[PDB]
């Protein structure tokens, strides 16, 4: 599924992302735009063998199992493919664990370089 901006914002809000660990909703929508272009099916391979999956490009090194990343962990206890679903529940729940780990949203490289320090509110402007 490729989400619309406001559609995604409302889904994210429903699952408790607005102000989660102090990050306003516009930060999350911003990150998803530049991580995946709002597409739940996005995948990107990294140089070390691991792969990033879903709207928030969660990495198979630590967070999910894809059966081809040897010596990796599965801290969200899910198949990586579950992160490619039209239903973003699993993505959201795993992201809650990541942003809680000490590093905040800096774990998302595109957020740090393209969203941090900017007017993130603009990403939910117009939405009901």
Ligand X SMILES: C[C@@H](O)CN1CCN(CC(=O)O)CCN(CC(=O)O)CCN(CC(=O)O)CC1
Residues with active-site annotation: 35, 52
**Smallest distance from ligand X to CB 33, Å:** 6
Residue number with CB closer to ligand X (48 or 128): 128
- The answer to whether residue 5 forms part of the interface with ligand X (CB under 6 A) is yes
- The answer to whether residue 116 forms part of the interface with ligand X (CB under 6 A) is no
Question: Please, is 47 exposed, middle or buried when counting C-beta atoms within 10 Å of its C-beta (0-12, 13-18, 19+)?
Answer: exposed
φ/ψ region of 23 (left if φ > 0, alpha if ψ in -120 to 50, else beta) reads beta
User: 4 is written with which tokens?
Assistant: 């619309």
Task: Report how far residue 18's alpha carbon sits from residue 9's, in angstroms, rounded to the nearest whole number.
Answer: 9
Q: Known binder of ligand: residue 101?
A: yes
**Which residue number is nearest to ligand X in terms of Cβ?**
122
Helix (H) or strand (E) holding 98: helix 89-99
Q: Which of 2, 75, 109, 122 binds ligand X (CB under 6 A)?
A: 122
| Residues 36-75, interacting with ligand X (CB under 6 A) | none
**Torsion angle defined by CA atoms of residues 50, 109, 16 and 101, in that order, rounded to the nearest 10 degrees:** 70
- The answer to whether residue 123 forms part of the interface with ligand X (CB under 6 A) is yes
**Smallest distance from ligand X to CB 77, Å:** 32
Residue number with CB closer to ligand X (98 or 120): 120
Binding region for substrate = 101
């Amino acid at each position: 599924k490729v989400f619309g901006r406001c559609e995604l914002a409302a889904a994210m809000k429903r699952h408790g992302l607005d102000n989660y660990r102090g990050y306003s909703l516009g930060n999350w929508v911003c990150a998803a735009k530049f991580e995946s272009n709002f597409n739940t099916q996005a995948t990107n391979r990294n140089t070390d063998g691991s792969t990033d999956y879903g709207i928030l490009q969660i990495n198979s090194r630590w967070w999910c199992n894809d059966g081809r990343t040897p010596g990796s962990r599965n801290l969200c206890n899910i198949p990586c493919s579950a992160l490619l679903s039209s239903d973003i529940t699993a993505s959201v729940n795993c992201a809650k664990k990541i942003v809680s780990d000490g590093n905040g949203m800096n774990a998302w490289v595109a957020w740090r370089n393209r969203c941090k320090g900017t007017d993130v509110q603009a990403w939910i402007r117009g939405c009901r």
